[PDB]
Each structure stands twice: as C-alpha cells, then as structure tokens.
Amino acid sequence: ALAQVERTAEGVVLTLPEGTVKKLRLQVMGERIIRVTALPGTDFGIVPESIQVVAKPATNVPFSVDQAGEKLVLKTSQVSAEVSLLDGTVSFRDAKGNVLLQEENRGTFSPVIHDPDPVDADSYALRQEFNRGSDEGFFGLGQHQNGQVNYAGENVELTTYNLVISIPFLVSSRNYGLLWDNNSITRFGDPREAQPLNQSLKLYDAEGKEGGLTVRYFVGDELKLTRVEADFNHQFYKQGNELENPFPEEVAGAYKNNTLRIELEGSIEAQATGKHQFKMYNSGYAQLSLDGEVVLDRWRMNWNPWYHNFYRELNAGDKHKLKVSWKPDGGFFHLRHLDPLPANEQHELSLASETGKAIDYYFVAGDTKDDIISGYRQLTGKSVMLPKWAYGFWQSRERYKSSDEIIQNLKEYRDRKIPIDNIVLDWSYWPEDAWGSHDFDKQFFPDPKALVDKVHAMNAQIMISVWPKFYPTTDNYKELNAKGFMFNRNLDEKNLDWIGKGYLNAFYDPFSPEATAIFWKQIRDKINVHGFDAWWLDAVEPDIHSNLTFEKRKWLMTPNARGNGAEIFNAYAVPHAEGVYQGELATDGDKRSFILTRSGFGGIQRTGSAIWSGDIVSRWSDMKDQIAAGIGTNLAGVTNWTFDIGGFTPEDRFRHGKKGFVGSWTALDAEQVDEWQELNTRWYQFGAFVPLYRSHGQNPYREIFNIADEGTEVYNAMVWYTKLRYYLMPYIYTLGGDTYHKDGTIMRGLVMDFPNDRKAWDINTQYMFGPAFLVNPVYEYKARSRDVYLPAGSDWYNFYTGEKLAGGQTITADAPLARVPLFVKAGAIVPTGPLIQHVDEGLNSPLLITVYTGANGSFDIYEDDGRSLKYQQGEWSRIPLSYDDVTGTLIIGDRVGSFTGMADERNIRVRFIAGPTADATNFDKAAAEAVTYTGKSVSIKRPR
Numbered sequence: 001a002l003a004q005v006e007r008t009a010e011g012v013v014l015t016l017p018e019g020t021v022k023k024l025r026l027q028v029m030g031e032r033i034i035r036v037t038a039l040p041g042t043d044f045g046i047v048p049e050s051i052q053v054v055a056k057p058a059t060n061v062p063f064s065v066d067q068a069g070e071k072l073v074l075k076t077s078q079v080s081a082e083v084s085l086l087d088g089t090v091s092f093r094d095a096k097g098n099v100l101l102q103e104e105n106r107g108t109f110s111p112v113i114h115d116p117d118p119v120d121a122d123s124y125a126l127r128q129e130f131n132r133g134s135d136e137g138f139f140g141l142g143q144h145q146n147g148q149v150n151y152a153g154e155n156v157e158l159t160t161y162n163l164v165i166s167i168p169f170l171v172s173s174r175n176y177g178l179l180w181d182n183n184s185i186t187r188f189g190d191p192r193e194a195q196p197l198n199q200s201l202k203l204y205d206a207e208g209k210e211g212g213l214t215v216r217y218f219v220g221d222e223l224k225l226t227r228v229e230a231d232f233n234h235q236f237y238k239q240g241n242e243l244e245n246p247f248p249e250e251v252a253g254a255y256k257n258n259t260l261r262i263e264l265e266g267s268i269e270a271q272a273t274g275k276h277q278f279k280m281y282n283s284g285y286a287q288l289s290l291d292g293e294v295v296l297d298r299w300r301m302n303w304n305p306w307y308h309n310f311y312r313e314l315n316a317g318d319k320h321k322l323k324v325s326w327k328p329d330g331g332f333f334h335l336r337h338l339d340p341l342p343a344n345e346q347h348e349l350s351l352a353s354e355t356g357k358a359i360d361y362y363f364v365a366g367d368t369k370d371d372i373i374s375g376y377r378q379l380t381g382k383s384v385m386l387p388k389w390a391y392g393f394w395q396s397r398e399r400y401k402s403s404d405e406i407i408q409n410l411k412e413y414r415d416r417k418i419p420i421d422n423i424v425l426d427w428s429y430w431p432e433d434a435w436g437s438h439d440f441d442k443q444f445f446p447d448p449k450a451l452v453d454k455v456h457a458m459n460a461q462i463m464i465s466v467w468p469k470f471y472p473t474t475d476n477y478k479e480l481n482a483k484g485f486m487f488n489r490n491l492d493e494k495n496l497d498w499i500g501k502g503y504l505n506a507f508y509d510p511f512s513p514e515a516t517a518i519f520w521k522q523i524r525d526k527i528n529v530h531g532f533d534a535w536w537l538d539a540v541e542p543d544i545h546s547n548l549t550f551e552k553r554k555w556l557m558t559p560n561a562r563g564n565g566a567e568i569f570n571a572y573a574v575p576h577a578e579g580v581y582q583g584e585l586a587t588d589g590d591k592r593s594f595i596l597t598r599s600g601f602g603g604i605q606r607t608g609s610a611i612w613s614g615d616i617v618s619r620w621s622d623m624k625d626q627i628a629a630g631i632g633t634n635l636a637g638v639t640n641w642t643f644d645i646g647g648f649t650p651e652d653r654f655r656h657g658k659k660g661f662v663g664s665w666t667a668l669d670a671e672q673v674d675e676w677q678e679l680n681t682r683w684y685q686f687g688a689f690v691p692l693y694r695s696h697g698q699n700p701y702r703e704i705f706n707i708a709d710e711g712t713e714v715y716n717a718m719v720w721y722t723k724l725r726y727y728l729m730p731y732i733y734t735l736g737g738d739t740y741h742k743d744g745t746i747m748r749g750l751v752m753d754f755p756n757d758r759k760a761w762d763i764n765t766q767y768m769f770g771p772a773f774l775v776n777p778v779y780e781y782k783a784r785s786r787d788v789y790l791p792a793g794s795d796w797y798n799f800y801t802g803e804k805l806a807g808g809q810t811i812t813a814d815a816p817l818a819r820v821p822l823f824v825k826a827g828a829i830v831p832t833g834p835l836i837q838h839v840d841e842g843l844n845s846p847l848l849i850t851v852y853t854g855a856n857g858s859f860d861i862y863e864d865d866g867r868s869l870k871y872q873q874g875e876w877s878r879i880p881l882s883y884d885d886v887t888g889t890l891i892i893g894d895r896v897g898s899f900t901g902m903a904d905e906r907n908i909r910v911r912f913i914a915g916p917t918a919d920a921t922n923f924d925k926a927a928a929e930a931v932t933y934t935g936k937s938v939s940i941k942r943p944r
C-alpha cells in the first residue's frame with residue numbers, strides 16, 4: 001500500500017493512501033534548500049501566501065528523482081531527501097551521505113484551541129517532531145529573554161511581545177537549519193502552553209495542610225489578611241486598567257498606592273519525575289525561594305511585566321518548600337509551570353503552531369552557520385544595506401520635549417568632541433488630542449524643517465517616532481477607516497491610553513498593501529516632507545492596549561486582511577515595515593532608508609530595519625539576558641539588532657530623589673549614584689559591541705554628560721568606548737557591508753566560529769563581534785573580573801595589553817570598572833581609521849592595519865558612499881588583506897571595484913602584534929610601516 005508519486009517541475013508530490021496527511025510535497029528552492037509541505041487535504045491552494053518567504057521554487061537547479069522499493073530520493077548537488085513511500089517521512093542527508101535530520105512521524109494535527117475567534121474548518125493545531133534522542137545543539141529562534149543560547153532540551157515560546165521577537169529560524173549544531181513558516185504563535189519543545197502552578201503539581205499551604213498556597217496580604221509590614229488560594233493569579237487586565245481578578249476588598253487600596261505587599265508559602269509535589277520548567281510572570285519586586293534557596297530575584301516596571309524561567313529536576317512524591325515575595329507596586333503576577341514530557345520526547349526536536357492549514361517548513365543545508373543564515377536570507381530576502389551612519393552612535397531619550405532640547409543635546413556632544421551620528425525624536429511631538437495626525441505641536445516644535453536642517457547642519461541624522469496608532473478624532477484615522485483598514489474593537493472596549501484623562505485609540509491593519517500605501521502617504525505628506533532621516537516604528541507587536549490577555553490581543557486584530565488575530569500573531573511588523581520601505585523606495589530611488597522597529601518576524605531584514613529588545617529594565621539580570629537575546633536574533637538570521645543602553649526603565653530609586661525629578665545624575669540621592677554610574681558604564685561597554693550602538697530610555701537622562709561629570713573615570717570610560725567605536729568604523733562598516741553582500745552576521749554565538757567545541761555551544765555571556773573580537777560583558781554590580789572561556793584551537797590576544805593566551809581554557813579575566821574584557825583571535829586583521837566625530841568624516845580615511853600574528857589571516861575591507869543605493873549597481877570597493885604567518889607577510893591585494901567619491905590613493909600603515917605591547921590600543925601613535933596604496937597589490941614583511 002505505497003504512496004503515489006507525481007513528478008513536478010519543482011520536485012515531487014506524494015499522495016499517501018493512509019492517515020491524516022493526504023499529500024506531501026517537496027519543492028527544490030535552491031541548491032541547499034528544500035521546502036516540505038504536509039497537507040491534510042488535496043488542495044495545496046488553501047495554504048496562505050507566505051509573509052516570510054519571498055522566494056519562489058528554483059528553475060535553474062539540477063535535481064534528480066530516483067524511486068526504488070518503499071523509499072523515494074530527491075537530491076541536489078548539496079542536499080538529499082529520502083521519503084518513505086509507507087508513511088511519508090523525510091530524511092535529509094548531506095552531499096556525503098550523513099543523516100542530518102529525520103522526521104519521527106508524519107506530524108500531529110489537532111483542533112485549534114487558542115483562537116478566541118471563529119475558526120476556519122480547515123485550520124488545525126500543527127506539530128512536527130524530529131531527531132529523537134539527538135545530542136545536537138539548537139540556536140536562533142529570535143530574541144528571547146531567558147538567557148538561552150543552546151535551546152536543546154528546553155522550551156521556547158515564539159510569541160510576540162514588547163520584549164520578545166520570534167523569528168522561526170532554527171539552526172542546528174549539525175550542518176542544517178530550518179524555517180518554520182507559520183505566522184501564528186509557535187512553541188519549541190513542549191507543545192503545551194505553560195499551565196497554572198496547580199495543574200501538574202499538588203499544593204500544600206503553610207499549615208502543611210493540602211489545598212492551595214498560603215496567600216498573605218500586607219499593607220506596609222502589617223498583616224491584613226491570610227487565606228489559601230489554588231491558582232494565585234493577577235496576570236492581566238480585562239479592560240482599561242481593571243484587573244481580571246481583583247484584589248481582596250481589604251487591601252485593594254494598598255495595591256493602588258504601592259503599599260501593598262504579598263507573600264506566598266507552601267509546598268509543591270510533582271506527580272511525575274524529570275525536568276520541570278517554571279515561569280514567574282511579574283512586575284514590581286518579586287523573589288522566589290525554593291528549598292530554602294533563592295532561585296529568582298526580579299524587578300520589572302509595573303506596566304511591562306514578563307516571565308522569568310528556570311528548570312529543575314524533580315522526583316514524584318517529593319514535597320519541596322516554596323516561598324515567594326511580591327511587592328506589586330501596581331504590577332502583575334501569575335505563576336506557571338510545566339511537567340516533563342514523555343521520556344522519549346525528552347531530547348527531541350519539536351515545533352508546534354496554534355493555527356495553520358498545513359505543516360510547512362524549509363530544510364536549509366550549510367557547511368557553516370554563515371552558510372545556513374545565507375539560506376534564510378535567500379528565502380526571506382537579503383538584509384538590505386543600512387546607511388553607514390546607522391552603525392555610528394545613536395542618542396535617544398524618552399523623551400526630548402522641544403526642537404531646542406534636541407539641538408542643545410546634540411550640540412553638547414559636538415562641543416565635548418564626543419562622536420555621535422544620530423539623535424532621536426520620540427513620541428508626543430503632536431498636539432496631544434491628535435495622535436496619528438502627524439502634526440507638530442507649534443508650542444514645542446514650531447518649525448520641523450528648521451529643526452531637521454539644524455541637525456543636518458551639525459552633520460547628524462535625525463530619526464522620529466511613528467506608531468500604528470490613531471485617535472478617531474483625526475482625519476488620518478477617518479481616511480484609513482473609510483477603506484475598512486482600522487482595527488476598531490479597542491474603541492468598542494473603550495480602552496483609553498495613558499495620555500491625560502486618557503484617549504480612545506485604534507491601530508491600523510497593515511496586512512493589506514492598499515492599507516500600508518495609505519499609511520505611507522500619510523507620513524510621507526506630514527513628516528518625510530521636512531527631511532527626517534529615519535523612522536522609529538514603535539509598538540508594532542502590536543501593543544494596542546497594554547496588559548490585556550493574549551487572547552484579547554488576538555481578538556483585537558480580528559478581522560484583518562488575513563483572517564484572525566491568532567493566524568498572524570507574530571507577523572505584524574513585516575508588512576508594516578514593508579510599506580514604509582516600499583514608499584521610501586518610491587520617493588527616493590537613490591537614498592538608503594532606515595527603520596528601527598520593536599518587533600519582527602522572518603523577512604524583517606528585507607525592509608532595511610533594525611530591531612531592538614524594547615522596554616527592558618535597568619537591572620543587571622536584564623543586561624545579562626540581552627546577550628542571549630542578541631545572539632538568538634543573529635543566529636535566527638536577523639543581524640541588525642540593538643537594545644536601550646542602560647535599560648528603558650530604571651527603578652524609582654533612580655528616577656526620583658530628595659531633589660525631585662532626576663534629570664542629570666546630580667539630582668540622584670547620594671547612595672544611588674554609584675550603581676547608576678557603574679550600571680551605565682558596563683552597559684555602554686556592551687553597547688559599543690552590539691550591531692547598533694544606542695543610548696535610550698526614561699529618566700534619568702542618558703547622554704554621557706548626564707550620567708557623570710567630565711574628567712571622572714566613568715565619563716572617560718564611556719567616551720573611550722564611543723571613540724573606540726569610531727576608531728573601529730572601517731572594521732565595523734565592513735561587517736555592515738557584509739550583512740548584504742556576504743549574507744553576514746555581526747553578533748555571533750560561539751557555535752558559528754567554533755562549531756566543533758561543545759563547551760562553547762552553551763555559553764551565554766560571551767560572543768564574537770565580527771571575526772576578530774571575543775566580547776565578554778561584565779554583568780554583575782561591583783565585579784572587577786569575570787570568568788572568560790577562551791575557545792579551543794585558536795590563540796587569543798588581550799586587546800588592551802597584547803598578552804597572548806592559549807585557547808581551550810577558562811581564565812579569570814581582569815575587568816576593572818573602565819574596561820570590558822576583550823580578546824582578539826590570533827590571525828585577525830583589524831583595520832582602524834582616524835578619530836572621527838561621525839561616519840562621513842572617515843570616508844576615504846587613512847587606515848591602520850593591525851595584524852594579530854600566530855595564524856593566517858584574511859579580511860577584505862568594504863567601502864562605498866554609505867548613503868546611496870548605488871552599491872546595488874556595483875558601486876562599492878574591497879581592499880583585500882591577506883596574512884601568511886609562516887612567512888610573516890601581509891599582502892594588501894589589488895582593490896576590487898570602485899564608487900563615486902572613492903579616493904584612488906590611500907595612506908595605509910601596517911603593524912603586527914605578537915605579544916605584550918604598551919601601544920596595543922594607541923592607534924595614532926603606534927610604530928607601523930607606512931605605505932602609499934594606489935589600488936595595486938603591495939606586501940609588508942613583519943619586523944624581525
């Protein structure tokens with residue numbers, strides 16, 4: 001009873017005679033890429049046009065189809081897929097006959113359970129399982145906030161949130177990755193949503209007596225009520241600002257005035273054995289203790305809570321002591337958990353989605369992780385070049401309040417000769433009762449074009465905040481609405497925002513290009529006309545009303561152009577940013593646009609956008625977590641990424657003192673100054689080594705000169721790392737060029753460059769910044785050193801001192817306040833330029849080429865005009881650098897390419913580092929051999 005085979009031009013289509021899956025289509029997408037579509041029906045046409053994939057089946061890719069017995073082989077020069085004619089399961093082999101990925105079953109289709117709205121009869125909950133009992137690593141998946149780099153054996157929920165951005169591209173430690181092309185909420189590992197604490201556990205209160213947990217309510221230190229609760233849950237608002245479950249009547253007042261405190265106490269007993277996951281979702285100060293030990297200490301701003309996870313081994317029957325402390329300060333809280341899966345699934349690959357019409361994924365083969373990302377780029381679109389100024393320093397604030405305030409702070413950087421390219425105008429520049437009109441309050445921003453012109457005249461660019469949000473009072477709302485493009489259920493719910501008495505508001509519907517075209521014409525007419533340089537597309541999750549349930553959030557986007565809110569929950573930002581990008585293209589066909597946006601999904605990089613992690617807090621745990629967040633995003637195939645240096649929201653201890661509202665650090669209560677300055681110093685260090693370097697957030701003010709005084713150690717350290725960023729621009733912008741021309745990745749998990757080192761795989765507090773720099777952020781208050789693992793098979797130089805160390809060891813790296821531990825890989829060729837104040841100053845600049853000896857090297861410096869689209873017609877250049885360590889020779893090869901404004905002649909000096917040197921970072925004054933390069937190859941011998 002074998003399956004029937006139909007040879008298509010793109011591959012094959014099996015018609016299985018058994019089971020739920022009726023048809024199984026394979027499509028050759030490229031030399032290294034095969035699409036798999038498992039359909040519970042006969043009409044593939046029911047499958048929605050991809051939002052991620054812009055790639056269509058290849059036409060010029062040789063492939064062969066051989067059939068024998070009960071196995072079908074379809075292969076290219078690089079990938080081999082063996083399908084069973086019995087059950088329809090696919091097995092992927094490399095070009096040398098090794099099992100990369102094997103499907104377990106044909107996939108589990110279930111009824112949709114998480115769509116609050118009416119469900120298409122041909123929609124299902126999807127699940128697919130692969131590689132049971134593997135030992136492989138798993139990476140990518142997007143920007144997540146639980147410290148995971150190697151996801152293997154654990155859970156990730158690919159939902160969309162302020163702080164979370166799912167990109168369903170999974171990369172293995174083996175030579176493949178895959179794109180799971182589903183727009184709805186998706187889960188890695190455990191299929192189930194994390195449940196209430198009492199759904200897979202037995203609960204005992206303080207009295208030891210079975211039941212629920214002991215829930216004490218405190219006002220101040222005064223106990224005001226004790227009682228036992230099953231599922232303690234104040235996770236969401238139902239409407240407006242009203243909790244879903246209100247607080248006991250007798251402390252309800254304390255909640256609203258921040259005097260409320262709470263404790264939970266009891267014992268948990270799992271009925272099953274194995275690894276359990278736990279999630280403490282919260283705002284305010286929360287602290288969880290288990291077995292007498294603290295497991296979680298977290299604070300998050302009240303309006304932006306999130307989950308804090310940890311796994312732990314449990315034996316059934318075993319009771320364990322649980323203690324929790326929650327000072328809500330008006331925030332939220334729930335406690336969730338999941339018991340272990342069936343043991344045979346304990347170590348498998350599992351992806352599930354909430355709604356879809358078919359299991360649809362793309363197998364991507366690649367000999368290196370860069371090769372694998374490259375497949376992702378080809379499916380979902382090339383990461384289009386950002387303007388060169390985007391890799392310079394960005395200064396933002398929530399918020400500047402006038403044209404004057406912006407020009408003043410920019411001028412202050414220039415006066416202090418501290419480099420900066422970009423300043424940002426955040427929300428609330430419009431008349432307060434016209435959010436969405438895109439007008440400029442005449443009191444504070446009387447002449448926008450003059451303000452942009454003053455920024456430009458100071459050789460900076462300016463970016464501006466634009467939401468998908470409209471008040472129904474405004475004409476722009478009315479215009480979108482008459483075409484049916486407004487999501488109106490938030491108006492019905494009467495959900496007012498947080499501005500003034502509070503306004504009625506709705507978000508538009510970007511899932512139709514007729515809609516995004518209007519959105520774009522609106523901002524074109526109102527904002528673009530004054531010459532702003534970039535768009536800060538905030539709130540694109542969307543976050544229509546903060547803190548409603550995710551079902552409400554789903555419900556609110558129904559109906560959109562693509563069905564329900566649930567069917568497209570992760571995808572909002574792509575079409576939204578696409579419209580802005582496409583309009584800009586239509587407007588100026590020779591200027592690079594830039595978008596910064598707070599959400600994404602597969603393909604976002606095709607809109608010339610960078611993403612950031614949104615509203616993180618000014619905590620150390622958060623800074624640390626940002627490392628895994630950026631890693632996971634780059635390894636998901638989206639490299640242009642950043643965060644708010646210093647965190648979006650500090651605690652109250654920082655925002656407000658005895659001297660009132662804290663702007664400058666001078667207004668801080670004395671006892672806080674130290675941590676505010678150290679947290680910012682450490683974060684600026686980290687910031688200069690992520691793809692985009694950007695300071696932003698709520699008060700205190702975040703300019704370097706508002707964090708500390710001139711001359712102080714911390715001021716000088718922050719200025720030093722900013723300068724270093726610009727010294728490094730020839731290196732950095734090369735990475736920038738590479739994102740497009742070489743499908744490159746800037747912020748690299750260690751698996752990309754040391755894939756054969758299992759111990760590197762798991763590391764979540766270090767990463768490669770480009771090919772040369774091993775970056776190791778200090779993430780602990782008052783730490784003056786940190787463990788650093790030096791990966792095996794390479795030697796390493798201390799960037800600051802020149803000391804050479806061997807890899808394959810962990811060291812205790814010196815980390816004084818002023819320096820983040822930084823190491824260069826033996827063989828790096830690092831180009832630097834002169835000190836500059838903004839990127840254009842350094843065009844055609846003199847170069848210092850620094851060769852870190854001990855291994856061969858290779859680095860081709862990428863240059864172009866930095867602003868135009870001419871690079872797409874070939875207007876760019878590469879200056880090839882090649883180092884041979886045996887002969888000790890650096891070859892500066894023949895220049896490749898050319899572009900308008902490129903200097904034919906370049907002054908280049910070359911130096912070699914081989915050990916300790918006082919000039920390790922003294923770029924201007926270092927001894928080095930000088931060369932007048934004219935595009936012709938020239939060799940420089942290392943000194944004897």
Ligand SMILES: *[C@@H]1O[C@H](F)[C@@H](O)[C@H](O)[C@H]1O
Nearest residue numbers: 398426427465538539615
């Ligand atoms: C969206 O809201 C504001 F506009 C901005 O300051 C914040 O950083 C972002 O989350």
Ligand SMILES: [Cl-]
Nearest residue numbers: 458459840841
């Ligand atoms: Cl200038």
Ligand SMILES: [Cl-]
Nearest residue numbers: 414458459837
């Ligand atoms: Cl200048």
Ligand SMILES: [Cl-]
Nearest residue numbers: 836837838841
């Ligand atoms: Cl200048």
Ligand SMILES: [Cl-]
Nearest residue numbers: 459837838841
């Ligand atoms: Cl200048």
Ligand code: NI
Nearest residue numbers: 459837838841
């Ligand atoms: Ni200048």
